[PDB]
């Protein structure tokens, strides 16, 4: 009986490949041959945030592009002022082994999680004037890998249970369960319209999810190793992926297939973090070789190198206005990068 | 401008002072990782040192010996896959690995798990502590002779007792040959890779053994001393 179902499923896989091939007219690299190259980009460290004890694993940027939150494995969450470097809040986490952190769009809530399997939520704008644990979410049997905020009452959660879930802040229960991944889900990114989101798993595949329906729409299996980082294009029609096989891939929703791949011969180490710029022309990917590389999102050539970290970069973030880029690595140091005339 | 920024500067100074105060207690405590299979007696070990020395995710056990704080974390209810979340444990003082030597069936899996941990790129910096649990069960079953070890490890029939093997005051020499052969098997994997970056400390441990806390404290002290000497470029 199982043989019949497996044979039926095998045939359907060929149909997807044929449909994807039928639309493959030309590579994106071919059509971009007439565009002007970006050229070498010089980036210098404008601000250096230090004070964390253990290695920094994740960070996020605020909507106002003024404050950012960073997570370190010492059990401390610190909110940094990018302009004047003062620390506005220090949150002593209940669990030291934290792997992710999120910043609410309204700036009133901050969430974090890790190996504790609990999504701790902290309220900043409190009537008393002190940070406290607002709500703690439990139900995941695996480690907490990533989380993002849709609004003040809804939060998207990614864990190692090969499943994602949408949580209600007030109810504290899973509104929907996102099932279909086979490996541990590493990270997810929300579209600008906060309508659809995609998440990468440890199975060399990516899936398109819908928060309203809770069912898969598109699947991309272009990568060869486990996908570590993922980020949405600012236009909402594409998204890039980073994996351990030292290559970066850009996928488009309408095309349902890859456009090109970013790779180079001296790079033998995978990518940990990846994000786009405001215009989307620059693709910044944090590699494991103690520095970050900037890739052209149309020409796929190297635009620059963000060196200065003694250890692997674990997180990368670009502000909503593209004014600066801040990178966090395992040396407990945060480097903010900006251009010059 | 400066009037409003004064409060921010004072708050930042207070946060820095709190961070500096917490840094001392953070660095005073030593972090440890506990790894092992289901058959290994990790539960017995943690029960023994949590009583004598004072969905859920990972667990935490805090014990103090010789006025030194130690923290150890267990895997907990995590999934079987561990290649992804084990990289964050690369800053712990050492890993306590528990192996059941009285079964001869899951021993090969224990060897493979130890080899992967030892050869891991992120875990190659920090040392691993080896505990060979359930020695009494190993001694009893090898004395009975119903279950053999040569069938699972044919190299045992030609293996000889090391000259430096110091046994207990009284026990059958067959037990000594069996336990040291397993130890020699583990140290072969440990010495197969690593040019002095990390070391392995084999120790014989029983379920009711109350000296586990002392052995961990001595092993942690040796690792700290060796790391300091490495920083001095003396070793």
């Amino acid at each position, epitope marked *: 009986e199982l043989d019949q179902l497996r044979q039926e499923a095998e045939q359907l896989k060929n149909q997807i490949r044929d449909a994807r091939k039928a639309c493959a007219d030309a590579t994106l690299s071919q059509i971009t041959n007439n565009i002007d190259p970006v050229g070498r980009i010089q980036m210098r460290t404008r601000r250096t945030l230090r004070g964390h004890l253990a290695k920094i694993y994740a960070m996020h940027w605020g909507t106002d592009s003024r404050l950012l939150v960073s997570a370190s494995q010492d059990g401390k969450l610190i909110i940094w002022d990018s302009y004047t470097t003062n620390k506005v809040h220090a949150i002593p986490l209940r669990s030291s082994w934290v792997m992710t952190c999120a910043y609410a769009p309204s700036g009133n809530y901050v969430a974090c999680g890790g190996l504790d399997n609990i999504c701790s939520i902290y309220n900043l704008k409190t009537r008393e004037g002190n940070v406290r644990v607002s709500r703690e979410l439990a139900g995941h049997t695996g480690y907490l890998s990533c989380c993002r905020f849709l609004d003040d009452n809804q939060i998207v959660t990614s864990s190692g249970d090969t499943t994602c879930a949408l949580w209600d802040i007030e109810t504290g229960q899973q509104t929907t369960t996102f099932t279909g991944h*086979t490996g541990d889900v590493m990270s997810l990114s929300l579209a600008p319209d906060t309508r659809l989101f995609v998440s990468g798993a440890c199975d060399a595949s990516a899936k398109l999810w819908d928060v309203r329906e809770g069912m898969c729409r598109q699947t991309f299996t272009g990568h060869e*190793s486990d996908i570590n980082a993922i980020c949405f294009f600012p236009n909402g029609n594409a998204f890039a992926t980073g994996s351990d*096989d030292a290559t970066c891939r850009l996928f488009d929703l309408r095309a349902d297939q890859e456009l090109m791949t970013y790779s180079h011969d001296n790079i033998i180490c995978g990518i940990t973090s990846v994000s786009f710029s405001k215009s989307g022309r620059l693709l910044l990917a944090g590699y494991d070789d103690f520095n970050c590389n900037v890739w052209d999102a149309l020409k796929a050539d190297r635009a620059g190198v963000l060196a200065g970290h003694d250890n692997r970069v674990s997180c990368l973030g670009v502000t909503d206005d593209g004014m600066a880029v801040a990178t966090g690595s395992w040396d407990s140091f945060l480097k903010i990068w900006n251009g010059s005339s | 401008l400066s009037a409003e920024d004064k409060a921010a500067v004072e708050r930042s100074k207070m946060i820095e002072k709190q961070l500096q105060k917490d840094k001392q207690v953070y660095r005073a405590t030593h972090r440890l990782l506990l790894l092992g299979a289901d058959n290994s007696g990790k539960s017995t070990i943690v029960k023994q040192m949590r009583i004598y020395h004072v969905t859920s995710g990972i667990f935490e056990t805090k014990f103090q010996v010789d006025k030194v704080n130690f923290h150890m974390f267990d895997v907990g209810a995590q999934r079987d896959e561990r290649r992804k979340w084990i990289q964050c444990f690369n800053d712990v003082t050492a890993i306590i690995f528990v192996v059941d030597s009285s079964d001869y069936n899951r021993l090969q*899996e224990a060897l493979n798990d130890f080899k992967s941990i030892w050869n891991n790129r992120w875990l190659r910096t920090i040392s691993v502590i080896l505990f060979l649990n359930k020695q009494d069960l190993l001694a009893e079953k090898v004395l009975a002779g119903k279950s053999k070890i040569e069938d699972y490890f044919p190299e045992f029939a030609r293996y000889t007792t090391p000259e430096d093997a110091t046994p207990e005051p009284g026990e059958d020499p067959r037990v000594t040959r069996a336990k040291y052969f397993i130890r020699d098997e583990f140290l072969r994997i440990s010495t197969a890779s690593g040019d002095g970056r990390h070391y392995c400390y084999p120790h014989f441990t029983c379920s009711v053994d109350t000296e586990n806390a002392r052995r961990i404290f001595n092993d942690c002290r040796d690792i700290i001393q060796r790391m300091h000497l490495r920083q001095y470029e003396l070793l």
Partner: nanobody
């Protein structure tokens, strides 16, 4: 898409010989280390043998030490494992598993219950 498919098996008299084959695709086979796993009926997955990227380093399990020979051919994109001197305790479903990341010297989740880089396996039965 990364996929693996093993071949070879069936009913073999005890003491016979076999030669499993699997054709890797969707990734650079020369840059990934490969392992072999069998699952006995009623028993968990256990490591069998492995071979390095270039084949310079080869290791075997004690129960299969010297019995079996494992080799890879990067040109033909195919992995091989010679099985001779079979005994009826060797009946198991043999799976071919890959390592998570390329250019690595550590291969962790091969023996895990669920793995995304292993083939469907082939039935190998040794009965008289």
């Amino acid at each position: 898409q990364v996929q693996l498919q093993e071949s070879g098996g069936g009913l073999v008299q005890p003491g016979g010989s076999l030669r499993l084959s699997c054709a890797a695709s969707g990734f650079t086979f020369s840059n990934y280390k490969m392992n072999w796993v069998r699952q006995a009926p009623g028993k968990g997955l256990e490591w069998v043998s492995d071979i390095s990227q270039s084949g310079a380093s080869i290791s075997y399990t004690g129960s299969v030490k010297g019995r079996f020979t494992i080799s890879r051919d990067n040109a033909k994109n195919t992995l091989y494992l010679q099985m001779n001197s079979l005994k009826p305790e060797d009946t198991a479903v043999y799976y071919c598993a890959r390592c998570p990341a390329p250019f690595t010297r550590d291969c962790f989740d091969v023996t895990s219950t669920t793995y995304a880089y292993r083939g469907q396996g082939t039935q190998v039965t040794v009965s008289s």
